[PDB]
Structures are given as C-alpha cells and as structure tokens.
Amino acid sequence: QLPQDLKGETFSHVFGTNTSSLELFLMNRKIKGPCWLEVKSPQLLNQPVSWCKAEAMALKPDLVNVIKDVSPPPLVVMAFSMKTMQNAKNHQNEIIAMAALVHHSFALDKAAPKPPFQSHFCVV
Amino acid sequence: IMEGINTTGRKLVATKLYEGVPLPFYQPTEEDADFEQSMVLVACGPYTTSDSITYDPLLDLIAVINHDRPDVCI
C-alpha cells in the first residue's frame, strides 16, 4: 500500500491509498442494508472455512447483484444470562452459571412473537 | 504510573509502581570548565531572636562574611 501523503513531479495528491475492501464492495454493488443478493458462477472451496451449513465462493465482486423483490426470512433469537464470582485467592472473575432462552422463528418484519421463547437450557 | 488489576472498574488493586526519572544534568561548556575555585556562603532567616529586634545574629553574620571574604553570599 502506498503512503497516504505520496507526492510526485507529475501528480500532486493521491486519493484512496488506505481504503478498505468492505466499503468498496458495499458501494460498488449498491447494497443498502441487509437484503436478498444474487451470486452467479459459484465456486467450491477446497476446505470449509466456516461453521455455516452452506458455503460458496465468488471470484469477482461484479458477479454478485442485489435483488430487492423478495420477502425477508425469520431469524433465530438467543438471549442468555451469566453469573460470576470473584476469585478468593486473586483478581479472577470465574463463571458459575449460564441460562439461555431461544426462539427459532423471530420475524424482523412482524410483531414480537408471544411467548418470545420456545426452548431453553441451564448449566451450573 | 501504576500497573495493577481492575476487573470491576471501580477499584484498582495495584501491583507495581514505576520509579520516576529525573531531568538530565546541565551539560558543561568548554568555557565553564576554565573557571577557578570559589566559595559560597549560605544562610537563612530569621536573623533575630524570637523576643528581640536588635538583629544581633545579622551583625554576627556580617562579621563572619567580612572575615571569610567568600566569593558569593546567599
């Protein structure tokens, strides 16, 4: 990466030296917020790179286009609470209990479901 | 500057105290080392007793200064 204040005999200033990849990808394809996206010509990775259930590869940014005429899907909501205890010996904050509530279908574009949780688990 | 443990954000359990660093000494010039030996007398007040106004210790100091003829008196 070239220096921010690069100067030369023929050019007076340089713009975009330290720019970030995510901003260029977002503005070049005109992606405004979470929405449905179309990706063409997918490639298959040699090895998995994520814990997600499905994976794909896009070779070039121009291979991904934004489609807005599709309804949004519901997400999964997970709330959790923790309890801690200071170590008697020295300066440590140990964890003794977790309690979580989960809902498998929470609609972003609708009202909050009642009850807002379906299953739960605890550990001590 | 302290080095300690602050897990709750309301109290610091200090563990190490950094020692301070003094300013650099005055760097002598070649002309400053050419000077000769000198004597400086130093005295501080009060120059009179707690019940008198005659200033006898001041006169004694003047006599000592005259006798010893120092280079500087503060």
Across the interface, do B13 and A91 touch by the CB < 8 Å criterion?
A: yes
B16 touches chain A (CB under 8 A): no
Could you tell me if B12 and B6 are in contact, meaning their C-beta atoms sit under 8 angstroms apart? Answer: yes
What would the DSSP string read from start to end of A82-111?
Answer: EEEEE-SSSS-EEEEEEEEEEEEEE-TTSP
| Distance, CA of A102 to CA of A73 (rounded, Å) | 17
Q: Which residues contact A55 (CB under 8 A, 6 or more apart)?
A: A45, A48, A49
What are the E-state strand segments in chain A? 37-39, 64-66, 75-86, 93-106, 119-123
Q: CB-based contacts of A81: which residues, under 8 Å, 6+ apart?
A: A98, A99, A100
Interface contact B5-A91, CB threshold 8 A: yes
Nearest CA in chain A to B11: A91
Residues of A with CB under 8 A from a CB of B: 86, 91-93
Instruction: Give me the DSSP letters along B2-66.
Output: EEEE-SSSS--EEEEEPPP-PPPPP---TTGGG-----EE---S--S-TT--S-HHHHHHHHHHH
Using CA coordinates, name the residue in chain A closest to B15: A91
The resolution, in Å, is 3.4
